[PDB]
Amino acid sequence: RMCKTPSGKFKGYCVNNTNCKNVCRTEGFPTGSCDFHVAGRKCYCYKPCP
Secondary structure (H helix, E strand, C coil): CEEEEECCCCCCCCCCHHHHHHHHHHHCCCEEEEECCCCCCEEEEEEECC
16 A cells, blocks of 8 residues: 655745655655645655555
């Protein structure tokens, strides 16, 4: 499973997945990617769950 987890330290616009990615990679996630669930762009971190 791909666990999409809301980024904690990400503050800003997740236009590119790569920024999300890096922030998630620094939070403790293999990768990060952007999502739209708010008026703007929200970074989410992806991690393999079963």
